[PDB]
Design a protein around this ligand. Sequence first.
Ligand SMILES: [Mg+2]
Ligand SMILES: [Mg+2]
Ligand SMILES: [Mg+2]
Ligand SMILES: [Mg+2]
Ligand SMILES: [Mg+2]
Ligand SMILES: [Mg+2]
Ligand SMILES: [Mg+2]
Ligand SMILES: [Mg+2]
Ligand SMILES: [Mg+2]
Ligand SMILES: [Mg+2]
Ligand SMILES: [Mg+2]
Ligand SMILES: [Mg+2]
Ligand SMILES: [Mg+2]
Ligand SMILES: [Mg+2]
Ligand SMILES: [Mg+2]
Ligand SMILES: [Mg+2]
Ligand SMILES: [Mg+2]
Ligand SMILES: [Mg+2]
Ligand SMILES: [Mg+2]
Ligand SMILES: [Mg+2]
Ligand SMILES: [Mg+2]
Ligand SMILES: [Mg+2]
Ligand SMILES: [Mg+2]
Ligand SMILES: [Mg+2]
Ligand SMILES: [Mg+2]
Ligand SMILES: [Mg+2]
Ligand SMILES: [Mg+2]
Ligand SMILES: [Mg+2]
Ligand SMILES: [Mg+2]
Ligand SMILES: [Mg+2]
Ligand SMILES: [Mg+2]
Ligand SMILES: [Mg+2]
Ligand SMILES: [Mg+2]
Ligand SMILES: [Mg+2]
Lengths: 88, 114, 68, 100
Amino acid sequence: PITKEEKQKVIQEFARFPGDTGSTEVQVALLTLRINRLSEHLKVHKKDHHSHRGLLMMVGQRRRLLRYLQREDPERYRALIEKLGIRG
Amino acid sequence: QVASGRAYIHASYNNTIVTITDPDGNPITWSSGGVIGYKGSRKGTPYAAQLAALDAAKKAMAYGMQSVDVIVRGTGAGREQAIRALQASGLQVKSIVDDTPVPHNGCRPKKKFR
Amino acid sequence: AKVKATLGEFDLRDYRNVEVLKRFLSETGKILPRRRTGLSAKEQRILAKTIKRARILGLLPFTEKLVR
Amino acid sequence: MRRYEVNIVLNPNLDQSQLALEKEIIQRALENYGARVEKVEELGLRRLAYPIAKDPQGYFLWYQVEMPEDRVNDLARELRIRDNVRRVMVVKSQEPFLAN
RNA sequence: UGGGAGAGGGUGGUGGAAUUCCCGGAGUAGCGGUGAAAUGCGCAGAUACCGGGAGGAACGCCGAUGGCGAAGGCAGCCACCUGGUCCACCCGUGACGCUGAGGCGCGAAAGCGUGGGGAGCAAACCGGAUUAGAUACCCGGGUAGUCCACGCCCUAAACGAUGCGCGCUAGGUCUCUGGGUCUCCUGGGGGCCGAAGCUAACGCGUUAAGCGCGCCGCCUGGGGAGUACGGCCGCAAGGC
Ligand SMILES: [Mg+2]
Ligand SMILES: [Mg+2]
Ligand SMILES: [Mg+2]
Ligand SMILES: [Mg+2]
Ligand SMILES: [Mg+2]
Ligand SMILES: [Mg+2]
Ligand SMILES: [Mg+2]
Ligand SMILES: [Mg+2]
Ligand SMILES: [Mg+2]
Ligand SMILES: [Mg+2]
Ligand SMILES: [Mg+2]
Ligand SMILES: [Mg+2]
Ligand SMILES: [Mg+2]
Ligand SMILES: [Mg+2]
Ligand SMILES: [Mg+2]
Ligand SMILES: [Mg+2]
Ligand SMILES: [Mg+2]
Ligand SMILES: [Mg+2]
Ligand SMILES: [Mg+2]
Ligand SMILES: [Mg+2]
Ligand SMILES: [Mg+2]
Ligand SMILES: [Mg+2]
Ligand SMILES: [Mg+2]
Ligand SMILES: [Mg+2]
Ligand SMILES: [Mg+2]
Ligand SMILES: [Mg+2]
Ligand SMILES: [Mg+2]
Ligand SMILES: [Mg+2]
Ligand SMILES: [Mg+2]
Ligand SMILES: [Mg+2]
Ligand SMILES: [Mg+2]
Ligand SMILES: [Mg+2]
Ligand SMILES: [Mg+2]
Ligand SMILES: [Mg+2]
């Protein structure tokens, strides 16, 4: 699972200001962490379709957040995808 | 020879088979509804089971046995009658136990039983 | 005349307390329904899980012959 | 780094020397699989409800252990290879749930 | 951030009950089956009983008008990996939302391909009864298949025969699961009876089939017919 320590490390890494926990960048970073871990799980557990539906839901949510960020701040959007290696 | 034995009663819906065994489970004698001159559905009647139990117990006394522990398997029509006949045949019935085998959701039954 | 009623406080997750847990079994070694026992549904679920654990461990029985 | 309870049932007709030998092998497995002991109980010889290995009694051991999760399935396997070990059950420790 | 319940999913192990088979013991005149029988099995020693061993498949009691899941579906127990969802705090972002033609993924059973496995059951098949006949219903056998891995197939009374989202409109009662000021109040599920309203009626009725808005799908008499032709998909069966 994902422990509180790595989650807090990500939150501090991507937050704009110290007390920030729900900005677009932080949400995208947490979604990317979950997606990476779940895809690693699914590379071994191929017949795990029920988890794969959740992965699809996560990918869609991140796509919506990225679209909003790109539409409201192109510089922030480009910096975030460069830092996360999202494009592809 | 032994004065203590076991009485197995196997009461299916078609027949009742009674066996007398030594305390190690090795049979000494047995009797069924067909051993008395019954055939067909009459083998399943309670009276046939009573006669089979009486016959098996009589053979057991002829062997020189006085007490039997009764084990009943199956839920046929002649179950209670056979048990009572053993109770009043000339043998000391210390205990009666039910040991019908039931699966813990095991093999698939035949169509008639589904 | 309820198993829960005639007892003190005890752990519902304890799979080694044979004396307490055996009170929740019928004469033939079968788990009692909520009618006989008196626990709630969640408590009954925990009791059934612990009883099965103790059955596997070899303490409580799976089945016992019926004696008239 | 998670808590587990390890229940072991062995041969009841095992002498003191062989019992200590098997205890040392169990401890060697525990250390080899990175488990830290927090409590130990030894209830001894108890009468089983049904025969195990055609034996009506069993010798019981109960360890409280703390170990990384990924090794738990390995350790248990190592505990099942010995011919004198009758039962091995490892469970996750749980807080007591109280009736009444 | 802190907690909860759960047959939600995948992988690896292992517990007993029971059926079958084999070995040994003991023992004898039938067993089995039906409405009644017969085929069948059995003195070359069956059935019933005891002990030992092997193997496969399914998990009794708990257990439910119960729970989980988008649907199909999910039930011994243990460990690991993983999805959804609920409550409390009212902390952060700042409309980032809803729906969705095509696309992609999933999708009971049966079926198909290549390996494995095979106890029980059992399409086809064989025999016995029944009957005017009995290509059935009942009985004795019996092969695929049912199980596992991988790959296909993509259908159903895939049903609540009720698309999804949001708001508004008396209550009463049963139940699962949270929080609290634990009499009681306040969330989230699952049922029953009923205001107003609706409906051809049956019935529905805060889990709407009421009152409204948004977006999608579908209908236009019955048969011909989910057929033909064309096209696409499939190894095939066949699907759209
Ligand atoms: Mg008969
Ligand atoms: Mg013969
Ligand atoms: Mg024999
Ligand atoms: Mg075999
Ligand atoms: Mg599902
Ligand atoms: Mg889900
Ligand atoms: Mg705030
Ligand atoms: Mg502001
Ligand atoms: Mg909207
Ligand atoms: Mg469209
Ligand atoms: Mg399918
Ligand atoms: Mg189905
Ligand atoms: Mg299938
Ligand atoms: Mg096949
Ligand atoms: Mg025929
Ligand atoms: Mg005729
Ligand atoms: Mg047949
Ligand atoms: Mg058959
Ligand atoms: Mg076959
Ligand atoms: Mg359905
Ligand atoms: Mg419809
Ligand atoms: Mg409609
Ligand atoms: Mg729609
Ligand atoms: Mg409700
Ligand atoms: Mg209600
Ligand atoms: Mg109702
Ligand atoms: Mg109503
Ligand atoms: Mg209602
Ligand atoms: Mg209408
Ligand atoms: Mg018209
Ligand atoms: Mg067509
Ligand atoms: Mg064509
Ligand atoms: Mg083709
Ligand atoms: Mg068609």
